[PDB]
Amino acid sequence: MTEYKLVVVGAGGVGKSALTIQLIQNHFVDEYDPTIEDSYRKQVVIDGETCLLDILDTAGQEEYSAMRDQYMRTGEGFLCVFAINNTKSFEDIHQYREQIKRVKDSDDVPMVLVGNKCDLAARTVESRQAQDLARSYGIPYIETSAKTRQGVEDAFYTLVREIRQH
Amino acid sequence: MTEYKLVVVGAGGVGKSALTIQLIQNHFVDEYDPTIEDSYRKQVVIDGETCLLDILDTAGQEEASAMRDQYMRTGEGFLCVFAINNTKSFEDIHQYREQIKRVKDSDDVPMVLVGNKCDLAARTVESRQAQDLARSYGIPYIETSAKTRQGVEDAFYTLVREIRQH
Amino acid sequence: QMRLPSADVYRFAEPDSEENIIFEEGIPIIKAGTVIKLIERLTYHMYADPNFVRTFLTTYRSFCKPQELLSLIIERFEIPEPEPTEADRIAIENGDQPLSAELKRFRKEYIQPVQLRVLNVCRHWVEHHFYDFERDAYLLQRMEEFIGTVRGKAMKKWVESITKIIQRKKIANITFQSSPPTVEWHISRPGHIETFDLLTLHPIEIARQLTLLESDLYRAVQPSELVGSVWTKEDKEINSPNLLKMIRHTTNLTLWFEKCIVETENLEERVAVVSRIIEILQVFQELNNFNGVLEVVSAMNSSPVYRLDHTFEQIPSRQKKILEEAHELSEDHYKKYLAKLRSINPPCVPFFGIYLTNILKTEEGNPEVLKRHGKELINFSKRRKVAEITGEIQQYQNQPYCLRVESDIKRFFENLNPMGNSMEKEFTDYLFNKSLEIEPRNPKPLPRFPKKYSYPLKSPGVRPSNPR
Ligand SMILES: Nc1nc2c(ncn2[C@@H]2O[C@H](COP(=O)(O)OP(=O)(O)NP(=O)(O)O)[C@@H](O)[C@H]2O)c(=O)[nH]1
Ligand SMILES: NCC(=O)NC1CCN(Cc2c[nH]c3ccccc23)CC1
Ligand SMILES: [Mg+2]
């Protein structure tokens, strides 16, 4: 069966890591251990075709900024995450996309823009601005919740469809 | 890799802590700060194999003599230390060996007799006398200095070879 | 068995139930509990658990304030003694002296071990986590008064000890088996710091001095910079400055390697530069500097450099192999790296990034409390997972390298500044443009460029020499 290598990218300090964790973690209990083998591997059924997800999430390593090229080059598809209560992370999305395009040497890499709600602070990025940014890049936009797991399957499954339809 | 639980025992002031810090950190401690119970870990390659040393440094002061059974139960091998300028500490060694044998209910416990402070001239225990004791226990005798690092690796690594061949 | 004081006058005498403590499934391992029960187990009368003490003092600030911890162990320390028993009453009524067998047993088997273990918590607190006291003078005052007013000669030795330790810490030499190797020079000779550069210093001595530099930076990172995922928060410059110094040095080196390559426009000279950098990588492997290995690999995999096909075509076959092995260390989520690290004989310099991701994901992936029977227990198995990671870190910080520092080469590398006054985005674009100027996209033809280096480009090799 096919293995997709997805890479999550985006600003640190705003709950990016919730995405992969909520995806993988036995989302009906919580005893999570990132240490163990294949707590980043996940067999799933997307549109009836079984496939294996390989998620690289290097959250915490954001200051190793010269390592991004190496990490990005490993992936077939990209999840670009910002926090909806952090405008800076939204504005950084552009540089992440230009960097991805450059290490893949391509102008259409499969990617998804993901707006992540990581707490109960006030939204400062409206859906509309995000849709518009996503439309200008020609990529899907998806919002997720770091508490309720809402939108997390949609985000990854959408990215796989984006890869399959490339 | 295999993990080994070593325990360093002996009267107060003989250098149990100084030996362990010398082994672990290549540093000689000049202050005399009575131990209650300290723990250390050391990854090391012995006879071509990689192992994790879990070293427990114990209290030698008589005030804590009722709290030994608990650590003698867990330890896999014992480093029995005395100081060569201290006859009383050598006479106390008999008592540690007896207590270990009882608690572990075995006559075949891996240990090594260590005679510390061999960097000093004013010696009051003779090698012959210490060696005679070691043979009657059926264990090796090694003289060490925590100050000059003489014999330190030899003592800990010898003990590890004995736990291996147990 | 033995009788405890009343739970009404000594809170730490409450019986264990699933409403205050939960064990995992040869001492027990705690999965969750109340602060009271955690502190009781931290200082249990039956057994000591030194790995539990390290775990607690590393991670407690996420569920308990320092001032409140001190109040709780001061409370645990003052144990009420029992009243005289019937056999003691009857002896006194005949003018005899009591045996007091149960009071003597309670002192020897409960009070004395619980009080030493409380003191041991204090000792570890002051000796390995002194920053609680640096950031709070009142907390230190209370600790000194608590320790300074402990009466009873059974405690006397450790009380005098901890007093002296606290006083030293307030105002605040290595031995090797072997002698360190001779410092190696190439084209730049000692003292001629103005000539120092990637090709003029000896590649062996570059790897050595960078290894010493990075080992010092690695050894300086304390667990206070990690717990609470604080290196990722807004105040990370306050809370994590030694961690951030290390990461930024690693980033500088990587960018310095990238810059050395793409600013060498002549193809023959660039191949010499790339080849020398791979020779430095080889000595990193030798010295177990995995941080240096990944600096070099990150430079080779960067955008400006990875695309230089003409340069890598002319690299000696044996060095494609060295670089390809080093790159495989990072594949499959660092599978082979983790294995290599857990098998070498230290000293080494680990790669810090893996630990960072594991600590952060552990803190975001696990709830800070567990709800059981309408009670909120502290989830302690989460804190043990984090302290497991910080304990691995600290283990590789003990062993020093047996290498001589050369001050001038150290100063040169400390002061490296590839970006200069430019921002990261400008400098990153500069490197990539240089890459397109010196090896254009297909099908544009490959230009020629004049040499910039006057001195010989022949590598002196990575096998050490040894005069008498
Ligand atoms: N000259 C010399 N002094 C030593 C040596 N080993 C230890 N000492 C000194 O002896 C004193 C006691 O050392 P220490 O390690 O604290 O002894 P200990 O066995 O741990 N005692 P305790 O059981 O109370 O913890 C210190 O002053 C230390 O510097 C040695 O090999 N040579
Ligand atoms: N087959 C098309 C191709 O370009 N193959 C290689 C040619 C040269 N190259 C070697 C290389 C450059 N930077 C690296 C970083 C790590 C491992 C290998 C390399 C990488 C890709
Ligand atoms: Mg000691």
PDB file of C-alpha atoms and ligand atoms in Angstrom, chain A residues 73, chain C residues 296-302 305-313 320 323-328, ligand 2:
ATOM      1  CA  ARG A  73      12.905  17.952   1.218  1.00  0.00           C
TER       2      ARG A  73
ATOM      3  CA  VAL C 296      27.499  19.698   7.922  1.00  0.00           C
ATOM      4  CA  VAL C 297      24.626  17.569   6.594  1.00  0.00           C
ATOM      5  CA  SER C 298      22.215  20.485   6.968  1.00  0.00           C
ATOM      6  CA  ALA C 299      24.551  22.624   4.874  1.00  0.00           C
ATOM      7  CA  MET C 300      24.813  19.982   2.115  1.00  0.00           C
ATOM      8  CA  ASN C 301      21.032  19.586   2.027  1.00  0.00           C
ATOM      9  CA  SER C 302      20.281  23.284   1.982  1.00  0.00           C
ATOM     10  CA  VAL C 305      24.129  23.808  -2.054  1.00  0.00           C
ATOM     11  CA  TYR C 306      22.069  20.673  -2.815  1.00  0.00           C
ATOM     12  CA  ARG C 307      21.527  21.787  -6.416  1.00  0.00           C
ATOM     13  CA  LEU C 308      25.231  22.138  -7.318  1.00  0.00           C
ATOM     14  CA  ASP C 309      25.393  18.912  -9.374  1.00  0.00           C
ATOM     15  CA  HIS C 310      28.586  19.909 -11.190  1.00  0.00           C
ATOM     16  CA  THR C 311      30.440  20.284  -7.893  1.00  0.00           C
ATOM     17  CA  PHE C 312      29.341  16.986  -6.352  1.00  0.00           C
ATOM     18  CA  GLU C 313      30.109  15.110  -9.557  1.00  0.00           C
ATOM     19  CA  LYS C 320      30.272  10.532  -1.372  1.00  0.00           C
ATOM     20  CA  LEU C 323      28.413  12.073   3.294  1.00  0.00           C
ATOM     21  CA  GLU C 324      25.793   9.478   2.311  1.00  0.00           C
ATOM     22  CA  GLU C 325      26.284   7.505   5.569  1.00  0.00           C
ATOM     23  CA  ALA C 326      26.063  10.721   7.604  1.00  0.00           C
ATOM     24  CA  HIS C 327      22.851  11.684   5.822  1.00  0.00           C
ATOM     25  CA  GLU C 328      21.312   8.259   6.528  1.00  0.00           C
TER      26      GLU C 328
HETATM   27  N1  LIG D   2      19.750  11.810  -9.365  1.00  0.00           N
HETATM   28  C1  LIG D   2      19.670  13.263  -9.408  1.00  0.00           C
HETATM   29  C2  LIG D   2      20.636  13.901  -8.354  1.00  0.00           C
HETATM   30  O1  LIG D   2      20.789  15.083  -8.351  1.00  0.00           O
HETATM   31  N2  LIG D   2      21.301  13.062  -7.433  1.00  0.00           N
HETATM   32  C3  LIG D   2      22.267  13.546  -6.357  1.00  0.00           C
HETATM   33  C4  LIG D   2      23.435  14.204  -6.970  1.00  0.00           C
HETATM   34  C5  LIG D   2      24.321  14.980  -6.005  1.00  0.00           C
HETATM   35  N3  LIG D   2      23.879  14.990  -4.638  1.00  0.00           N
HETATM   36  C6  LIG D   2      24.658  14.631  -3.792  1.00  0.00           C
HETATM   37  C7  LIG D   2      24.369  15.479  -2.541  1.00  0.00           C
HETATM   38  C8  LIG D   2      24.396  16.877  -2.437  1.00  0.00           C
HETATM   39  N4  LIG D   2      24.070  17.242  -1.192  1.00  0.00           N
HETATM   40  C9  LIG D   2      23.818  16.135  -0.424  1.00  0.00           C
HETATM   41  C10 LIG D   2      23.442  15.977   0.956  1.00  0.00           C
HETATM   42  C11 LIG D   2      23.259  14.740   1.467  1.00  0.00           C
HETATM   43  C12 LIG D   2      23.434  13.576   0.642  1.00  0.00           C
HETATM   44  C13 LIG D   2      23.796  13.723  -0.662  1.00  0.00           C
HETATM   45  C14 LIG D   2      23.993  15.010  -1.210  1.00  0.00           C
HETATM   46  C15 LIG D   2      22.460  14.908  -4.314  1.00  0.00           C
HETATM   47  C16 LIG D   2      21.566  14.359  -5.432  1.00  0.00           C
END
